[PDB]
Design a protein around this ligand. Structure first.
Ligand SMILES: [Mg+2]
Ligand SMILES: [Mg+2]
Ligand SMILES: [Mn+2]
Ligand SMILES: [Mn+2]
Lengths: 455, 455
DNA sequence: GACTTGTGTATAAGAGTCAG
DNA sequence: CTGACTCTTATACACAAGTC
DNA sequence: GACTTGTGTATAAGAGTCAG
DNA sequence: CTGACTCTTATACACAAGTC
């Protein structure tokens, strides 16, 4: 009702095994305040409390605080929630956290050896429920700093995927069985496939490298090309401006893409490992843009067309992780931090990752009931007042649908492409507004409740 | 009361000679909404009105709209206000407006010929009342695009200073007499001095180039060095982190600087032009940092120590223009714009310059009475509620002083250096907050005024 | 039980940014 | 160009709250 | 007076950003 | 890497409001 950020924070970080209750408690607080003011400074998040501000700073630079522990705590929570769903998607990818202030020096390599920007590489596992594909939470994160000299690396970077699974398993436990891992072409690694199968784990992986199907003695593509057409499907590709490494700008006009779909069993040369596969390829593609084509490898069934489309769907949700990445930087301000020591920075940013998720969830919580499912009478009331005269017939006077647009519109949303879809950032903006105005709504209340003249 | 941004905009742009009342009217509106949401997008400034949004866009890309005219309009206003003061300072400097999106191509050179960032050079005159040094307004702006090939320039860039004066004069008219021009070492131009004197205009200019004093046959410095010590003064130099062109970071610790002061009449070689001068030089400077030293040239009296300190003071206010520059970019979002054509962009940014000023004024309006001088009972009321328990004894319960900190604190302000001074951006943030919450304060009012249950 | 550790409150300053 | 701040880190006191 | 021009409302899309 | 949007610019209708 009155205290979400706070509730949220407790939910997520209540189990932090910090080595002192005080810590865990601070954590929740910090988390809370940060969340409340997603994207803003510790300072601003402190609402003027010096005590808070000092608490927060102290926390992140607290040498007894383990970021791992922090991350683990929030993850645990993910597991917990996961308990409620029968099929889960475990998205997995790597991103970077880049800094160029003094501390960057103490950080890892990201580009060239003389590159001023440095920091961490973080491989994450983001969980979704496979039914409506909503975001459940972070399940894992492996942060690391890349040595300037590759010979200085103890383990190949490529073992992350494997590192991830193991942690997943450990963490999910018996629930692993309901988890499907989704990864981009970079995970096209034999050892990887192999390891998953070994464990009887499920997955969807995009194919990067040509491989042979022992059975047919052909390359996956070629073999799949020969399979019968299960059907196909179509996608709307949206307009956009594009840029290249050289900075050449061009228009990528919208279009409708038609894809052929085929699937089959295959056996890879190496472990002589058998698995299913799917191939979606665009038909009569436009001479300009590049042909859409996905070849995926999975544990999942691919026989009929429904099955194979399920597969396509699953993978299509991989992008959610890219949204998470951006939600953590641009959104939560991961890269906007300027802590002066690697550990302080890491501790801070680790908390920000949970905020990133939340931001994502926020919209989901407004996506397809009556508004008061979600909102409170006063907010609901205010919202209504604020939205006075902007509602469209389409939106039931007072539904959850209404709510979302209303908040979106408070957010600045104007449906420029008329898709009716608002970015998570717009929604966050609207929510923020709503809660800000509410303050005054409730201020007044309190006054006139204690019998006081407004004017 | 209820509509400042709007009032403000009318004040400033009501005379725009746009060639159609509709235009001027749009202008005011646009201005208004932008101001209301200083720093934010047209879109967000549109509060959901499509009509507004479209009005705004249309305006800035309106080929019948003259930016000059826009700028002139707002300036006129400055003149008007200037009427109320006996001594004015006319700050003058050049800045750049830098873009790197497609349009940049159609823009001017700013750095190297292969530099992706391009745009305009803008030389401005910013007026202040010389009594409390508050900001009055923009008096002039000369925008221009620098050719890749210098031989392609019709007029030296250096004639700006002269271009400025002429426009000032024209504009100030008979009031020029009460105007003192303040400029950095770059205006150390003979023709410049000469032109001012020719007109009997007053000024304060920092000396860049060594020159001879005919009378003494010595260099200004040397001659001044020989003058008797009028006294001196001291300045508190604040701590700060510093960076160089190479990116080497260092700490510039705080310190108290002691300056010797001397003044005198001189006559420059060239027009055999006589004028006064002042020399402030730091005594027993710290081996590290560089010695503070200013040699200034003026029309003003410099004989006694009071007179010369007045001079120092005047020049010390030159920095206000640097604040204005930043208020226009970072603040108002000048460089955040992404109009796709030079004129659209210029029209937009021209309006933003007035917003920049306002931002500056905002704090001034809270600087050293009772709060309700400035605020309204409801805001005043809300503010109070919001500030409940943060006020310090120092601040009278309910004064203008109180108001400023209260708003500053809403702004995120925490007095990290305990100077008690809040940036203009913090204050803007607090004001924005206040007005945002007010909305809800007043929402509720309206409800319960029409007899309606809040909850 | 003996020995740290966090809080809230104060005071101070190094580090970083965007403006020169 | 004689800046003007915010964000980050730090320390002390008197007590509170934790750990081993 | 005859001939443009802005508004508000609709529909469409190119341009730009940060994430790959 | 099979994106997901926002900011900017554009056009039409039916009228309103301006200019020469
Ligand atoms: Mg360090
Ligand atoms: Mg162009
Ligand atoms: Mn300057
Ligand atoms: Mn990625």
């Amino acid at each position: 009702a009155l205290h979400r950020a706070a509730d949220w924070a407790k939910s997520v970080f209540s189990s932090a095994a910090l080595g002192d209750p005080r810590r865990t408690a601070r954590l929740v607080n910090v988390a809370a305040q940060l969340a409340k003011y997603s994207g803003k400074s510790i300072t601003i998040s402190s609402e003027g409390s010096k005590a808070a501000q000092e608490g927060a700073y102290r926390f992140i630079r607290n040498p007894n605080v383990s970021a791992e522990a922090i991350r683990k705590a929030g993850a645990m929570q993910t597991v917990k929630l996961a308990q409620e769903f029968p099929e889960l998607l475990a998205i997995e990818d790597t991103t970077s956290l880049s800094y160029r202030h003094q501390v960057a020096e103490e950080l890892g390599k990201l580009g060239s050896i003389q590159d001023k920007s440095r920091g961490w590489w973080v491989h994450s596992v983001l969980l979704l429920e496979a039914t409506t594909f909503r975001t459940v939470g972070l399940l894992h994160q492996e942060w690391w700093m890349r040595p300037d000299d590759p010979a200085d690396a103890d383990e190949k970077e490529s073992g992350k995927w494997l590192a991830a699974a193991a942690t997943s398993r450990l963490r999910m436990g018996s629930m692993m069985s309901n988890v499907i891992a989704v990864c981009d072409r970079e995970a096209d690694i034999h050892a990887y496939l192999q390891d998953k199968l070994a464990h009887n784990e499920r997955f969807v992986v995009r194919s990067k490298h040509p491989r042979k199907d022992v059975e047919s003695g052909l390359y996956l593509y070629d073999h799949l090309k020969n399979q019968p057409e299960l059907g196909g499907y179509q996608i709307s590709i949206p307009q956009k401006g594009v840029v290249d490494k050289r900075g050449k700008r061009k228009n990528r006009p919208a279009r409708k893409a038609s894809l052929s779909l085929r699937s089959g069993r295959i056996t890879l040369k190496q472990g002589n490992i058998t698995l299913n596969a799917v191939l979606a390829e665009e038909i009569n593609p436009p001479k300009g843009e590049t042909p859409l084509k996905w070849l995926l490898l999975t544990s999942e069934p691919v026989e009929s067309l429904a099955q194979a489309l399920r597969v396509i769907d699953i993978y299509t949700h991989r992008w959610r992780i890219e949204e998470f990445h951006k939600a953590w930087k641009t959104g939560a301000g991961a890269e906007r931090q300027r802590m002066e020591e690697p550990d302080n920075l890491e501790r801070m940013v680790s908390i920000l990752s949970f905020v990133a998720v939340r931001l994502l969830q926020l919209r989901e919580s407004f996506t397809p009931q009556s508004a008061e499912t979600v909102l409170t009478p006063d907010e609901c009331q205010l919202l209504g007042y604020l939205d006075k005269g902007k509602r469209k017939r389409k939106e039931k006077a007072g539904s959850l649908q209404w709510a979302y647009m209303a908040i979106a519109r408070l957010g600045g949303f104007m449906d420029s492409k008329r898709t009716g879809i608002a970015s998570w950032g717009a929604l966050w903006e609207g929510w923020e507004a709503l809660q800000s105005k509410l303050d005054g709504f409730l201020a007044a209340k309190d006054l006139m409740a204690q019998g006081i003249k407004i004017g």
